[PDB]
Amino acid sequence: ISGVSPLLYFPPTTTSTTNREDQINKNTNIAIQMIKR
Amino acid sequence: DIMVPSFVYNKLPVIHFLQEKRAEQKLRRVLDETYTEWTEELDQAHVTDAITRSLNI
């Protein structure tokens, strides 16, 4: 890790607002999609 | 009155036996045609993997 890095990497949490509803919803849409094909 | 009745009476046992055997054969054929159909469905792990890829992770 030689070399002074330029940044203090923060946790990539930027869109913590990923409402479980819509997150799971898109998963279900993908799941139903793959099964039909 | 005498002859045909006697010969019918003589016929009865063999016919009964053969018909019982035939019914048993029908039941055996009915049983032999039964098979359980085990189906295979797409594993959900692949679906989860596709979901991860779509996230650009």
Automatic annotation (TrEMBL), chain A:
Q: Can you name this protein?
A: Uncharacterized protein
What organism, scientifically named, is this protein from? Trypanosoma brucei brucei (strain 927/4 GUTat10.1)
Q: Which gene encodes it?
A: Tb05.26K5.220
Q: Which residues of the full protein are shown?
A: 17 to 53 of 370
Automatic annotation (TrEMBL), chain B:
- Give the GO cellular component terms, alphabetically: kinetoplast; mitochondrion
What UniProt keywords apply to this chain's record, in alphabetical order?
Membrane, Transmembrane, Transmembrane helix
Highest taxon in the source lineage: Eukaryota
Name of the protein described by the UniProt record: Uncharacterized protein
Species per Swiss-Prot/TrEMBL record: Trypanosoma brucei brucei (strain 927/4 GUTat10.1)
Per UniProt, what is the name of the gene that codes for the protein in this document?
Tb04.26G5.190
